[PDB]
Amino acid sequence: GSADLAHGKAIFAGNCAACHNGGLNAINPSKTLKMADLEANGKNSVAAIVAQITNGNGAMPGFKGRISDSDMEDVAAYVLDQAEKGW
Amino acid sequence: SADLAHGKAIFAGNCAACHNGGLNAINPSKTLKMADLEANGKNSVAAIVAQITNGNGAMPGFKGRISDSDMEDVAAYVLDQAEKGW
Ligand code: HEC
Ligand code: HEC
């Protein structure tokens, strides 16, 4: 495994897992982190997940200034990898 | 009571997305059950108004989005449901 992925996993647990436990979505069940939902919303890329983390959307807050760009890349890679291999 | 029905309406419009049925899917250790409010020192009008105003963790604040009067109505609704059982 990658050290970046393991680092992204830890950042995910601290910042994302309460709302996206197991790649789901507590608030909005139509916007999970499953690959099919990511693809249906054009979010199945590192750049699009980083943009989502940075700006947020709807009931998801933005993390600009609270998570470094480098850490955002790590968590984006963690999410996409889990999505591709199945949460 | 015009206050409790109004608080119910403000709750449906602002809190039900995360606290439907008095639960808390994001953080299941912090529901709106009276027992959880007691466990966190939140079983009071003053404490719930502060929570609404400032938020905490994954809960946003509502300052400027809900009037002070409506916040008191929401707090009374929550405590009434908590006491009766959601
Ligand atoms: C609750 C306060 C959340 C936090 C913390 C995190 N996410 Fe989120 N996310 C949340 C909601 C309510 C939504 C839907 C927003 C909308 O406007 O509909 C999302 C969405 C996403 C997505 C898009 C999913 C899709 O299109 O299927 C992604 C990729 C995503 N969220 C990622 C993500 C990350 C990496 C987080 C930790 C930094 C994170 N979210 C936190 C709710 C909340
Ligand atoms: C998700 C975007 C939320 C919305 C909208 C509302 N609440 Fe919330 N609430 C949420 C979380 C994640 C938490 C736990 C916060 C933490 O730091 O751990 C809470 C907590 C409360 C509490 C305390 C409950 C307890 O057992 O201690 C109360 C009294 C509360 N929330 C009330 C409340 C009201 C009245 C809302 C509508 C104005 C509201 N919340 C919206 C998540 C979210």
mmCIF file of C-alpha atoms and ligand atoms in Angstrom:
data_model
loop_
_atom_site.group_PDB
_atom_site.id
_atom_site.type_symbol
_atom_site.label_atom_id
_atom_site.label_comp_id
_atom_site.label_asym_id
_atom_site.label_seq_id
_atom_site.Cartn_x
_atom_site.Cartn_y
_atom_site.Cartn_z
ATOM 1 C CA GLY A 1 0.000 0.000 0.000
ATOM 2 C CA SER A 2 0.878 3.683 -0.304
ATOM 3 C CA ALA A 3 1.874 5.922 2.575
ATOM 4 C CA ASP A 4 -0.219 8.642 0.912
ATOM 5 C CA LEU A 5 -3.286 6.394 1.038
ATOM 6 C CA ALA A 6 -2.729 5.545 4.701
ATOM 7 C CA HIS A 7 -2.324 9.246 5.444
ATOM 8 C CA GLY A 8 -5.470 10.080 3.477
ATOM 9 C CA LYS A 9 -7.356 7.393 5.393
ATOM 10 C CA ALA A 10 -6.451 9.020 8.728
ATOM 11 C CA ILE A 11 -7.409 12.493 7.497
ATOM 12 C CA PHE A 12 -10.696 11.043 6.214
ATOM 13 C CA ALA A 13 -11.452 9.520 9.625
ATOM 14 C CA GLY A 14 -10.877 12.852 11.363
ATOM 15 C CA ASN A 15 -12.712 15.109 8.934
ATOM 16 C CA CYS A 16 -15.098 13.095 6.751
ATOM 17 C CA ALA A 17 -16.113 9.798 8.361
ATOM 18 C CA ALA A 18 -18.845 11.236 10.606
ATOM 19 C CA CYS A 19 -20.805 12.393 7.551
ATOM 20 C CA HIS A 20 -19.516 9.777 5.080
ATOM 21 C CA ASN A 21 -19.198 6.674 7.264
ATOM 22 C CA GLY A 22 -18.243 3.725 5.079
ATOM 23 C CA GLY A 23 -18.456 5.881 1.963
ATOM 24 C CA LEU A 24 -22.144 6.660 2.480
ATOM 25 C CA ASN A 25 -23.754 10.063 3.212
ATOM 26 C CA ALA A 26 -25.814 10.535 6.388
ATOM 27 C CA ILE A 27 -27.433 13.831 5.340
ATOM 28 C CA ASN A 28 -28.026 13.256 1.612
ATOM 29 C CA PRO A 29 -28.264 9.565 0.682
ATOM 30 C CA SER A 30 -28.116 10.356 -3.046
ATOM 31 C CA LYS A 31 -24.557 11.737 -2.802
ATOM 32 C CA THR A 32 -22.442 8.845 -1.506
ATOM 33 C CA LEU A 33 -18.763 8.178 -2.160
ATOM 34 C CA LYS A 34 -19.623 5.062 -4.170
ATOM 35 C CA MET A 35 -18.025 5.171 -7.622
ATOM 36 C CA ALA A 36 -21.419 5.083 -9.357
ATOM 37 C CA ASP A 37 -22.598 8.166 -7.449
ATOM 38 C CA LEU A 38 -19.259 9.945 -8.006
ATOM 39 C CA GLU A 39 -19.445 9.193 -11.732
ATOM 40 C CA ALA A 40 -23.090 10.282 -11.992
ATOM 41 C CA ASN A 41 -22.106 13.653 -10.506
ATOM 42 C CA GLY A 42 -18.828 14.115 -12.378
ATOM 43 C CA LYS A 43 -16.878 13.802 -9.117
ATOM 44 C CA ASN A 44 -14.835 10.688 -10.042
ATOM 45 C CA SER A 45 -11.457 12.457 -10.208
ATOM 46 C CA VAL A 46 -8.810 13.769 -7.831
ATOM 47 C CA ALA A 47 -9.355 17.348 -8.988
ATOM 48 C CA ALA A 48 -13.124 17.227 -8.507
ATOM 49 C CA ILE A 49 -12.843 15.742 -5.007
ATOM 50 C CA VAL A 50 -10.253 18.356 -4.020
ATOM 51 C CA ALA A 51 -12.639 21.061 -5.289
ATOM 52 C CA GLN A 52 -15.493 19.521 -3.280
ATOM 53 C CA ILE A 53 -13.355 19.451 -0.111
ATOM 54 C CA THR A 54 -12.147 23.025 -0.646
ATOM 55 C CA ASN A 55 -15.487 24.694 -1.414
ATOM 56 C CA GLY A 56 -18.107 22.322 -0.047
ATOM 57 C CA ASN A 57 -21.642 22.273 -1.417
ATOM 58 C CA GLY A 58 -25.115 22.409 0.124
ATOM 59 C CA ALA A 59 -24.976 20.922 3.602
ATOM 60 C CA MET A 60 -21.289 19.971 3.155
ATOM 61 C CA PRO A 61 -18.985 22.665 4.580
ATOM 62 C CA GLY A 62 -15.826 23.791 2.865
ATOM 63 C CA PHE A 63 -12.407 22.963 4.288
ATOM 64 C CA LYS A 64 -10.314 25.725 2.686
ATOM 65 C CA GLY A 65 -7.788 26.854 5.277
ATOM 66 C CA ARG A 66 -8.519 23.901 7.597
ATOM 67 C CA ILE A 67 -6.897 21.135 5.509
ATOM 68 C CA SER A 68 -3.719 21.675 3.518
ATOM 69 C CA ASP A 69 -3.773 21.243 -0.250
ATOM 70 C CA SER A 70 -1.322 18.364 0.103
ATOM 71 C CA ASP A 71 -3.571 16.653 2.649
ATOM 72 C CA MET A 72 -6.569 17.252 0.368
ATOM 73 C CA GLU A 73 -4.741 15.332 -2.361
ATOM 74 C CA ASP A 74 -4.098 12.456 0.058
ATOM 75 C CA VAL A 75 -7.740 12.217 1.106
ATOM 76 C CA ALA A 76 -8.897 12.521 -2.527
ATOM 77 C CA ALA A 77 -6.676 9.558 -3.432
ATOM 78 C CA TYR A 78 -7.957 7.574 -0.456
ATOM 79 C CA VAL A 79 -11.593 8.217 -1.433
ATOM 80 C CA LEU A 80 -11.176 7.314 -5.102
ATOM 81 C CA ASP A 81 -9.247 4.156 -4.214
ATOM 82 C CA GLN A 82 -11.922 3.018 -1.767
ATOM 83 C CA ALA A 83 -14.545 3.859 -4.390
ATOM 84 C CA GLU A 84 -12.787 1.865 -7.118
ATOM 85 C CA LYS A 85 -12.174 -1.169 -4.918
ATOM 86 C CA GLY A 86 -15.444 -0.923 -2.999
ATOM 87 C CA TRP A 87 -16.001 0.577 0.445
ATOM 88 C CA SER B 1 -49.344 27.382 22.255
ATOM 89 C CA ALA B 2 -48.298 29.530 19.302
ATOM 90 C CA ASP B 3 -44.655 29.132 20.386
ATOM 91 C CA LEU B 4 -44.394 25.324 20.340
ATOM 92 C CA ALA B 5 -46.069 24.895 16.933
ATOM 93 C CA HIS B 6 -43.829 27.639 15.526
ATOM 94 C CA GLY B 7 -40.740 25.930 16.973
ATOM 95 C CA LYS B 8 -41.854 22.678 15.365
ATOM 96 C CA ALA B 9 -42.046 24.470 12.012
ATOM 97 C CA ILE B 10 -38.621 26.092 12.379
ATOM 98 C CA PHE B 11 -37.245 22.679 13.428
ATOM 99 C CA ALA B 12 -38.705 21.009 10.323
ATOM 100 C CA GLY B 13 -37.124 23.680 8.133
ATOM 101 C CA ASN B 14 -33.649 23.865 9.704
ATOM 102 C CA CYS B 15 -32.899 20.852 11.945
ATOM 103 C CA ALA B 16 -34.755 17.821 10.555
ATOM 104 C CA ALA B 17 -32.119 17.214 7.861
ATOM 105 C CA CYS B 18 -29.769 16.053 10.655
ATOM 106 C CA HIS B 19 -32.039 15.433 13.679
ATOM 107 C CA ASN B 20 -35.070 13.683 12.148
ATOM 108 C CA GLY B 21 -36.985 11.950 14.926
ATOM 109 C CA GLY B 22 -34.684 13.494 17.515
ATOM 110 C CA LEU B 23 -31.761 11.349 16.338
ATOM 111 C CA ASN B 24 -28.309 12.366 15.058
ATOM 112 C CA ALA B 25 -27.024 10.136 12.257
ATOM 113 C CA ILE B 26 -23.793 12.154 11.959
ATOM 114 C CA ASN B 27 -22.948 11.723 15.670
ATOM 115 C CA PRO B 28 -25.180 9.045 17.236
ATOM 116 C CA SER B 29 -23.807 9.771 20.720
ATOM 117 C CA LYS B 30 -25.423 13.276 20.698
ATOM 118 C CA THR B 31 -29.128 12.838 19.946
ATOM 119 C CA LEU B 32 -31.950 15.117 21.087
ATOM 120 C CA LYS B 33 -33.208 12.478 23.534
ATOM 121 C CA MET B 34 -33.501 13.991 27.002
ATOM 122 C CA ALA B 35 -30.926 11.470 28.278
ATOM 123 C CA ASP B 36 -28.301 12.635 25.752
ATOM 124 C CA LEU B 37 -29.087 16.309 26.445
ATOM 125 C CA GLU B 38 -28.561 15.562 30.160
ATOM 126 C CA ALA B 39 -25.313 13.717 29.360
ATOM 127 C CA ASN B 40 -23.958 16.857 27.674
ATOM 128 C CA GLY B 41 -25.394 19.605 29.871
ATOM 129 C CA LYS B 42 -27.685 20.691 27.031
ATOM 130 C CA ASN B 43 -31.063 20.040 28.725
ATOM 131 C CA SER B 44 -31.983 23.716 29.027
ATOM 132 C CA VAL B 45 -33.285 26.587 26.908
ATOM 133 C CA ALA B 46 -30.082 28.585 27.384
ATOM 134 C CA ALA B 47 -27.883 25.674 26.330
ATOM 135 C CA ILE B 48 -29.894 24.790 23.221
ATOM 136 C CA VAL B 49 -30.053 28.436 22.137
ATOM 137 C CA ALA B 50 -26.256 28.633 22.450
ATOM 138 C CA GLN B 51 -25.892 25.422 20.417
ATOM 139 C CA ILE B 52 -28.175 26.752 17.675
ATOM 140 C CA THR B 53 -26.379 30.110 17.638
ATOM 141 C CA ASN B 54 -22.795 28.833 17.567
ATOM 142 C CA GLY B 55 -22.998 25.229 16.354
ATOM 143 C CA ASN B 56 -20.266 22.703 17.151
ATOM 144 C CA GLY B 57 -18.241 20.119 15.248
ATOM 145 C CA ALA B 58 -20.226 19.112 12.177
ATOM 146 C CA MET B 59 -23.246 21.170 13.329
ATOM 147 C CA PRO B 60 -23.310 24.664 11.783
ATOM 148 C CA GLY B 61 -24.295 27.790 13.642
ATOM 149 C CA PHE B 62 -27.537 29.561 12.812
ATOM 150 C CA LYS B 63 -26.729 33.096 13.989
ATOM 151 C CA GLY B 64 -28.355 35.524 11.566
ATOM 152 C CA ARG B 65 -30.393 32.734 9.931
ATOM 153 C CA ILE B 66 -32.851 32.161 12.810
ATOM 154 C CA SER B 67 -34.132 34.987 14.977
ATOM 155 C CA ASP B 68 -33.474 34.971 18.725
ATOM 156 C CA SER B 69 -37.210 34.589 19.295
ATOM 157 C CA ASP B 70 -37.440 31.644 16.899
ATOM 158 C CA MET B 71 -34.416 30.040 18.588
ATOM 159 C CA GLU B 72 -36.242 30.120 21.937
ATOM 160 C CA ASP B 73 -39.269 28.561 20.234
ATOM 161 C CA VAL B 74 -37.104 25.819 18.730
ATOM 162 C CA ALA B 75 -35.501 25.153 22.119
ATOM 163 C CA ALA B 76 -38.913 24.814 23.762
ATOM 164 C CA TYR B 77 -40.058 22.441 21.022
ATOM 165 C CA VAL B 78 -36.957 20.241 21.381
ATOM 166 C CA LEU B 79 -37.236 20.046 25.179
ATOM 167 C CA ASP B 80 -40.960 19.243 24.941
ATOM 168 C CA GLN B 81 -40.376 16.433 22.439
ATOM 169 C CA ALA B 82 -37.442 15.179 24.512
ATOM 170 C CA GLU B 83 -39.577 15.110 27.664
ATOM 171 C CA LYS B 84 -42.532 13.406 25.953
ATOM 172 C CA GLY B 85 -40.316 11.100 23.921
ATOM 173 C CA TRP B 86 -39.708 11.769 20.233
HETATM 174 C C1 HEC C 1 -21.253 16.993 6.891
HETATM 175 C C2 HEC C 1 -21.060 18.274 7.721
HETATM 176 C C3 HEC C 1 -20.130 16.595 5.892
HETATM 177 C C4 HEC C 1 -18.787 16.626 6.048
HETATM 178 C C5 HEC C 1 -17.969 16.827 7.344
HETATM 179 C C6 HEC C 1 -18.203 16.025 4.860
HETATM 180 N N1 HEC C 1 -19.202 15.839 3.935
HETATM 181 FE FE1 HEC C 1 -18.928 15.449 1.895
HETATM 182 N N2 HEC C 1 -20.914 15.710 1.552
HETATM 183 C C7 HEC C 1 -21.829 16.033 2.553
HETATM 184 C C8 HEC C 1 -23.099 16.346 1.956
HETATM 185 C C9 HEC C 1 -24.388 16.783 2.673
HETATM 186 C C10 HEC C 1 -22.895 16.168 0.458
HETATM 187 C C11 HEC C 1 -23.969 16.424 -0.608
HETATM 188 C C12 HEC C 1 -23.833 17.924 -0.875
HETATM 189 C C13 HEC C 1 -24.853 18.437 -1.870
HETATM 190 O O1 HEC C 1 -24.849 19.656 -2.166
HETATM 191 O O2 HEC C 1 -25.674 17.641 -2.377
HETATM 192 C C14 HEC C 1 -21.512 15.774 0.294
HETATM 193 C C15 HEC C 1 -20.905 15.476 -0.912
HETATM 194 C C16 HEC C 1 -19.615 15.023 -1.070
HETATM 195 C C17 HEC C 1 -19.015 14.545 -2.306
HETATM 196 C C18 HEC C 1 -19.779 14.409 -3.653
HETATM 197 C C19 HEC C 1 -20.472 13.040 -3.602
HETATM 198 C C20 HEC C 1 -21.269 12.654 -4.836
HETATM 199 O O3 HEC C 1 -21.373 13.460 -5.788
HETATM 200 O O4 HEC C 1 -21.805 11.506 -4.886
HETATM 201 C C21 HEC C 1 -17.734 14.217 -2.034
HETATM 202 C C22 HEC C 1 -16.680 13.656 -3.029
HETATM 203 C C23 HEC C 1 -17.489 14.491 -0.625
HETATM 204 N N3 HEC C 1 -18.651 14.982 -0.080
HETATM 205 C C24 HEC C 1 -16.312 14.309 0.063
HETATM 206 C C25 HEC C 1 -16.059 14.667 1.373
HETATM 207 C C26 HEC C 1 -14.768 14.639 2.011
HETATM 208 C C27 HEC C 1 -13.470 14.133 1.340
HETATM 209 C C28 HEC C 1 -14.924 15.030 3.281
HETATM 210 C C29 HEC C 1 -13.831 15.160 4.369
HETATM 211 C C30 HEC C 1 -12.843 16.295 4.026
HETATM 212 C C31 HEC C 1 -16.307 15.363 3.473
HETATM 213 N N4 HEC C 1 -16.988 15.121 2.294
HETATM 214 C C32 HEC C 1 -16.861 15.811 4.649
HETATM 215 C C33 HEC C 1 -21.611 16.083 3.904
HETATM 216 C C34 HEC C 1 -20.389 16.164 4.527
HETATM 217 C C1 HEC C 2 -26.088 18.929 10.399
HETATM 218 C C2 HEC C 2 -25.612 19.856 9.269
HETATM 219 C C3 HEC C 2 -26.920 19.537 11.571
HETATM 220 C C4 HEC C 2 -27.963 20.396 11.543
HETATM 221 C C5 HEC C 2 -28.557 21.202 10.360
HETATM 222 C C6 HEC C 2 -28.406 20.603 12.911
HETATM 223 N N1 HEC C 2 -27.667 19.788 13.736
HETATM 224 FE FE1 HEC C 2 -27.695 19.807 15.783
HETATM 225 N N2 HEC C 2 -26.075 18.558 15.869
HETATM 226 C C7 HEC C 2 -25.419 18.079 14.731
HETATM 227 C C8 HEC C 2 -24.190 17.428 15.132
HETATM 228 C C9 HEC C 2 -23.135 16.751 14.231
HETATM 229 C C10 HEC C 2 -24.139 17.529 16.642
HETATM 230 C C11 HEC C 2 -23.002 16.994 17.555
HETATM 231 C C12 HEC C 2 -21.975 18.130 17.570
HETATM 232 C C13 HEC C 2 -20.630 17.747 18.163
HETATM 233 O O1 HEC C 2 -19.738 18.627 18.239
HETATM 234 O O2 HEC C 2 -20.428 16.578 18.555
HETATM 235 C C14 HEC C 2 -25.339 18.245 17.012
HETATM 236 C C15 HEC C 2 -25.712 18.547 18.303
HETATM 237 C C16 HEC C 2 -26.879 19.181 18.660
HETATM 238 C C17 HEC C 2 -27.370 19.316 20.014
HETATM 239 C C18 HEC C 2 -26.661 18.713 21.251
HETATM 240 C C19 HEC C 2 -27.261 17.300 21.444
HETATM 241 C C20 HEC C 2 -26.618 16.537 22.589
HETATM 242 O O3 HEC C 2 -26.990 15.371 22.853
HETATM 243 O O4 HEC C 2 -25.712 17.081 23.252
HETATM 244 C C21 HEC C 2 -28.518 20.006 19.964
HETATM 245 C C22 HEC C 2 -29.410 20.394 21.171
HETATM 246 C C23 HEC C 2 -28.791 20.338 18.578
HETATM 247 N N3 HEC C 2 -27.774 19.807 17.817
HETATM 248 C C24 HEC C 2 -29.878 21.039 18.095
HETATM 249 C C25 HEC C 2 -30.085 21.402 16.780
HETATM 250 C C26 HEC C 2 -31.116 22.296 16.304
HETATM 251 C C27 HEC C 2 -32.217 22.884 17.208
HETATM 252 C C28 HEC C 2 -31.013 22.394 14.980
HETATM 253 C C29 HEC C 2 -31.893 23.204 14.000
HETATM 254 C C30 HEC C 2 -31.780 24.719 14.283
HETATM 255 C C31 HEC C 2 -29.867 21.619 14.581
HETATM 256 N N4 HEC C 2 -29.322 21.007 15.695
HETATM 257 C C32 HEC C 2 -29.417 21.459 13.297
HETATM 258 C C33 HEC C 2 -25.841 18.202 13.430
HETATM 259 C C34 HEC C 2 -26.760 19.111 12.955
#
